[PDB]
Design a protein around this nucleic acid. Structure first.
Ligand SMILES: [Zn+2]
Lengths: 51, 158, 97, 91, 121, 192, 54
RNA sequence: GCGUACGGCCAUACUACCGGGAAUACACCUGAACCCGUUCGAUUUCAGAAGUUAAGCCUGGUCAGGCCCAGUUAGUACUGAGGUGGGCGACCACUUGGGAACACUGGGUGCUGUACGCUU
RNA sequence: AUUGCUCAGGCAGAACAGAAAUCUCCCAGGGAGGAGAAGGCCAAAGGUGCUGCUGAUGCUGCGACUCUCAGUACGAGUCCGAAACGUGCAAUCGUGGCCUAACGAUCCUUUGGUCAAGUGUGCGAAUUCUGGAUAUCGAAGCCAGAGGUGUCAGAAAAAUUACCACAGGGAUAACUGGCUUGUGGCUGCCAAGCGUUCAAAGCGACGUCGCUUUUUGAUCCUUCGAUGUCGGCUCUUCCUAGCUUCCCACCCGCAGCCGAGUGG
RNA sequence: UUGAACAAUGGAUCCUACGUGGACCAUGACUGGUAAGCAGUGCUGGUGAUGCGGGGUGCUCCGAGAGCAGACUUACAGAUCCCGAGUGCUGGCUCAUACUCAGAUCCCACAAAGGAUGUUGCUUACUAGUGCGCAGCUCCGAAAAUGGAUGGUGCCCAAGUCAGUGUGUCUCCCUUACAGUCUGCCAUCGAUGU
RNA sequence: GUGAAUGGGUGCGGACAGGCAUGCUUCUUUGCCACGACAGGAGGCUGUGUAACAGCAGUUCUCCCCGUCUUCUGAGCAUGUU
RNA sequence: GGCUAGUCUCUGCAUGGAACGACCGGACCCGAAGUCCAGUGGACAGGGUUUCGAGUGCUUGCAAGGUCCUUGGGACCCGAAAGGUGG
């Protein structure tokens, strides 16, 4: 147990009664995966322009 | 031996020499160690601080770390079927500059000065081999070698 | 074993951050609160049938406690809590004796 | 009941089945443990490192420094050379 | 020095001696195989040229010459050679267990290893 | 009897473990090439076609772009003995020749939207039989969720991901295996 | 010998000679620079010999 | 041929006894207003230069004690490997290698670096 | 930590004062001291007096290591970085004891810190109790200690069974047998003495070499899916370390008798 | 002189399923014990896991290591016969009236102190003789219980014992292991061309 | 007070060795200016080949000296060259 | 790509080791200077560390099958003396 599962055998942290997870659900993306989500017709007609 | 202390079975080991007691001299402190240097880890019992373990008593390591009063040394230690690179932090009273590479460095400097200046003959250090035939005039006359008579008195002198 | 009544030591408190006078007091264990979470759990487990539930201690090998000392900084009134070794008797040094 | 506990009998054999080697001998050793002043100084040195092109032109300038003296003296010696060769002929 | 201090310590398992020119020749021409290409090949002049041409050695006479009179390339020749397999000798051994000086058949037979090789080829 | 040295067993792999007959056809082609052209590239491709599937790992158009980013590789063909999948993070690709065992729909579209070509290994064998101007790239076998767990977490220095079967705690403070041997508060913490 | 006294004396002579090495190391560095100059000259002379014989 | 200061190695340098010491010194040496320290200006601190090599220091001697060196002990003791060697054993011899120690004999009794001087 | 000094013991000397009080001089490599067991270490000192101090937890959720070792922890210890300090002219030395022993997991509790408050002579600088807030109410959390597991990698713990049972064990006792024979039993060698004189007719002290299994040990090799465990009776056979008979043996401190010893 | 020798199909990087975790034997390296086929250790090798030749027999000794066959040769060790191989060759020594027949290859299957005018040699003191001794064999010391064991027979200028010798050469130096050499086949692991 | 035999650690080079020039640093140093300014003379010199050193080639040459200007601390890590 | 049976440069995958003047989150220390506003004074920001993470540094994923295994299950098969519930 010491060698293959260190953190076994203990108790740590604030315990949260009635842990709601729907108000904590928050999938994250990144800026690297934004311009894939724009039809590149817009990405082209908006390149240097103001829109 | 039913006591494995840090200094167990070190009566003869950590004893100073006959008429060699006293703390180390200034030649021990004026030595200079650089990283990569080879050093004999040799415990000095007159200084009870920074001592290495008795298991690195005649081990030659290489310097990896230089602290103000001590030096870090990497010594190989056979555990059972491995070798581990033990790191010791040992003061410089318990370590000596190792001459284990002295002959090699002498030979290398010799060969390089040879090939730089054009004098010398570039040691290659073969073993001591068989000899050639000689004719050996040798005035000296041979002494009769042979067994001698047994004398109980001359054997059991009293 | 004696220990001074005061001791100049480093107070790691925002006002001081340096060596202060640090009056010395022994550490007395406080009354166990009956409303601590573990005590409440132990009570909820003890009540009912089944007898004793947690293991009591009987062996009692030690004859000495480690001595704990609260040094209170005379300026911050911040308490540094140090420990010394296993000693049978202990008293703050009345330095005349 | 009563056992024969300790023995070091087959241990060299088991230990020598495969060669007794150090795992990482050519590998570098971590910088953790190295003295803090030396680690900070390595960091700051590398920060201050110039680039290879700047270094090349620096070395070029250093070589060009003593050139007017060197080329002049060398050409003077090279001029005096054939007299030396013709004197060495007469030997 | 290096080889003799090993021969000493393994002497209870080996004999050794100083072979004659014709014994060397018989060994080479009747028992010699090449340790080449991780195989055990019968020596031929072409195999000798391939494995040792680098050293101006082209024929079996070169091998015999270096072996008998060491020459510069004894090391390369001997490495090229595969350890000779010899039959159990005719006549036989006096006694494996003693030394040659003790009447046995171990240690150094300085010249009486020709008598042994001759029985073993 | 003889005090033997170790009898030679060739470490290298010389039979495709792949069950795809067309991977076997490619192994046949590149056996032919590694024999009767005998270039280091052909021998490498033969090795990699032998490789099992763990060892010809997927590779991304981002790795293709990183390989060919240098101006030296204007006409080179990026060769991956692997499935090629698209890095959505990569937006602007250059015209690239890329040979592989399979191109995902996304990777194929991203490479053919930049004017590049998606080559199979037979096309590569007919274009560059010696594999000249071919940039071999492999794909990374670390970063696997198995490789991360290899070793022991309770060994100091080994930062192995503990094996958690199906138990993904929601409270990351009250996680599984995080207390005794994971904080010096609990009498010790596994060393780094 | 192998005495502690003999070994300590050999170490003290070693340290003496390392000190003298460091003491004459600047002069040695000058000499070695000139030696590398002569090695450069020798190499280039060999190169010229080869290029003229070819 | 030496002196002083700082040393390195730390007795071939120490210990005892008997002698000698040119110069520079070093040293002993003279006093207590101050700095300073003491039970006591003994040590120590300060301030000096009348005297002396008496001692310290240097140096010469000793079949001195010690220390060091060489020989010798001694191929003795011991010992790795080997034997279907011996022996009831105890243990010993042999083959192939390695190889001391005390004692005894005799000889010796610091070398030297940096700086400043003396001797000129 | 600075600094001064030199210890055990001894010669010699000084009123009471002596073996031993205190004082003085010389000698003294440590024969003292350093808390304790032993070992190592140490002399203008890892000793000791005086004095000054508190570095006896080097700010942290703070490092690399070493012994142990699975190269895990605890523990112990070495080496560093830099805050703040002690001492010192300073270099330095100092984060306990000159060094090798002197000690302790989860969970729980407790205290300190965090927080909160306070300061803030203007700003900040923040853990939680989930429908949103408040409350030096309470509770939880994280961090550092402490309360102990000595069976000391850490269950909470009395006996009896001849009324007994089960799974096993010849890993393991009690009976035979095996090895050894200390003990027991039986013989040897030497010769101080006894024997009226005379070491042996007969003994044989002090010493010492053996033998047997034949007592008791010692062991634990076979047997615990059982080899029926003492003695006696019955019946056979064998050994000789010979009691009787035989050689009417040889020898005597053998006249006879009765005997002693030795041999087959 | 690419700056010691020899060897080396190898170095690096990993993953992973098991069995084992009663050991025992041998050796002046030993410790406890009077000792033990006792108990505990050290180095190495063996047994376990291992058959084969020899030791009569024997898990551990000596030789050697094991695919199926053919030929040759040997190891240890052997040749009176049992039992393959000389009642070999050349010098000695020993004769033992028992119930231990004298003695008869390691382990190992025991022997001691002491004694002998048996015998063979040698040293040595005395002036051929007399003393001390010292080695080889032999004899006594030498006693257990079913009848029995150099393995049996038996052996006696041995078939005991100590040496030498069998030489690419020998009137007689030969025997043979699953070992060495050569060959064929089987299988394995490889190399090369495909 | 000595001290074996047997042992144990380390080292024995590239064709990565060895040498040379330069850079950076908040680390170290009194050791910076300076990656700066100035600078003379002597020379059958240097290398390959040789015990006859003849011969052959000339490369920012050899020496005073890696000079002087108060005279230029190391360490670690790099950039080049051989 | 030059070049040459001397042999130079550029590319640098995978893997292993080291590093980071990098960055994300946590923990320290000196600070909180500076910029800014969806303005209850709040949001970040700077420089340093012997710092930690199952961190990132061009996402190494999912599903099915198969092999050897693990743990719960009768759990390779057989095997207690026992304990309990109801008769
Ligand atoms: Zn305070």
């Amino acid at each position: 147990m010491d060698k293959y599962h260190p953190g076994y055998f203990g108790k740590v942290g604030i315990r949260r009664f009635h842990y709601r997870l729907n108000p904590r659900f928050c999938p994250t993306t990144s800026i690297s995966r934004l311009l894939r989500l724009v039809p590149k017709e817009q990405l082209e007609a908006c390149k240097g322009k103001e829109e | 031996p039913h006591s494995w202390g840090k200094k167990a079975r070190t009566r003869d080991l950590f004893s100073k020499g006959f008429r060699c007691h006293g703390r180390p001299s200034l030649s021990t402190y004026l030595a200079v160690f650089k990283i990569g240097d080879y050093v004999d880890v040799v415990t000095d019992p007159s200084v009870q601080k920074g001592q290495p373990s008795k298991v690195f008593q005649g081990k030659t390591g290489t310097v990896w770390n230089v602290t103000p009063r001590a030096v870090g040394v990497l010594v190989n230690k056979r555990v059972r079927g491995r070798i581990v690179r033990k790191k010791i932090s040992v003061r410089t009273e318990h370590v000596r500059k190792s001459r284990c590479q002295q002959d090699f460095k002498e030979r290398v400097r010799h060969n390089e000065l040879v090939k730089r200046t054009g004098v010398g003959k570039k040691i290659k250090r073969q073993p001591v081999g068989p000899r050639e035939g000689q004719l050996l005039k040798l005035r000296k006359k041979p002494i009769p070698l042979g067994a001698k008579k047994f004398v109980f008195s001359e054997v059991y002198n009293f | 074993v004696q220990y001074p009544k005061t001791r100049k030591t480093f107070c790691k408190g925002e006002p001081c951050k340096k060596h202060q006078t640090h009056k010395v007091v022994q550490y007395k264990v406080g009354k166990a609160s009956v409303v601590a979470q573990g005590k409440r759990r132990y009570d909820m487990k003890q009540k009912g049938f089944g007898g004793q539930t947690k293991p009591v201690f009987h062996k009692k090998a030690k004859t000495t406690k480690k001595i704990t000392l609260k040094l209170q900084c005379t300026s911050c009134k911040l308490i540094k809590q140090i420990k010394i070794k296993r000693c049978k008797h202990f008293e703050l040094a009345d330095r005349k004796g | 009941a009563k056992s024969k506990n300790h023995t070091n009998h087959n241990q060299n054999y088991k230990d020598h089945r495969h060669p007794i080697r150090l795992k990482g001998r050519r590998n570098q050793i971590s910088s953790k443990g190295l003295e803090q002043k030396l680690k900070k100084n390595r960091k700051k040195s590398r920060k201050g490192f110039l680039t290879p092109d700047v270094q090349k032109e620096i070395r070029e300038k250093r070589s060009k420094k003593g050139e007017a003296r060197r080329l002049k003296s060398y050409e003077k010696f090279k001029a005096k050379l054939p007299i030396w060769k013709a004197k060495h002929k007469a030997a | 020095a290096a080889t003799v201090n090993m021969l000493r310590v393994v002497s209870p398992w080996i004999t050794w001696g100083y072979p004659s020119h014709q014994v060397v020749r018989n060994l080479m021409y009747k028992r010699a195989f090449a340790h080449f290409a991780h195989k055990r090949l019968p020596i031929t002049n072409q195999l000798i040229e391939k494995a040792l041409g680098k050293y101006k050695i082209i024929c079996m006479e070169d091998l015999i010459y270096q072996l008998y009179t060491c020459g510069p390339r004894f090391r390369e020749v001997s490495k090229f050679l595969w350890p000779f397999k010899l039959s159990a000798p005719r006549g036989g051994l006096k006694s494996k267990k003693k030394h040659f000086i003790e009447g046995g058949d171990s240690g150094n037979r300085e010249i009486y290893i020709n008598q042994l090789i001759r029985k073993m080829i | 009897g003889i005090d033997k040295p170790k009898q030679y067993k060739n470490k290298d792999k010389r039979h495709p473990t792949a069950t795809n007959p067309y991977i076997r056809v490619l192994v046949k082609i590149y056996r032919f090439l590694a024999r009767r052209v005998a270039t280091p590239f052909n021998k490498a491709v033969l090795k990699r076609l032998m490789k099992s599937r763990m060892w010809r790992p997927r590779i991304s158009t981002s790795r293709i772009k990183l390989a060919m980013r240098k101006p030296d590789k204007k006409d080179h063909i990026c060769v991956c003995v692997s499935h090629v999948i698209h890095d959505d993070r990569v937006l602007g690709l250059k015209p690239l020749k890329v040979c592989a065992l399979k191109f995902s729909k996304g990777a194929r579209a991203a490479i053919e939207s930049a004017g590049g070509q998606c080559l199979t290994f037979d096309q590569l064998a007919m274009i560059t039989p010696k594999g000249s101007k071919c940039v071999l790239i492999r794909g990374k076998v670390t970063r696997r969720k198995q490789y991360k767990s290899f070793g022991a977490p309770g060994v100091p220095g080994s930062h192995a991901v503990p094996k958690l079967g199906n138990r993904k705690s929601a409270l990351r403070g009250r996680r599984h295996e995080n207390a005794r041997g994971r904080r010096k508060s609990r009498a010790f913490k596994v060393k780094a | 010998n192998n005495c502690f006294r003999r070994v300590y004396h050999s170490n003290w002579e070693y340290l003496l000679s390392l000190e003298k090495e460091a003491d004459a190391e600047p002069k040695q560095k000058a000499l070695r620079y000139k030696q590398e100059k002569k090695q450069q000259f020798r190499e280039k002379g060999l190169k010229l010999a080869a290029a003229k014989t070819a």
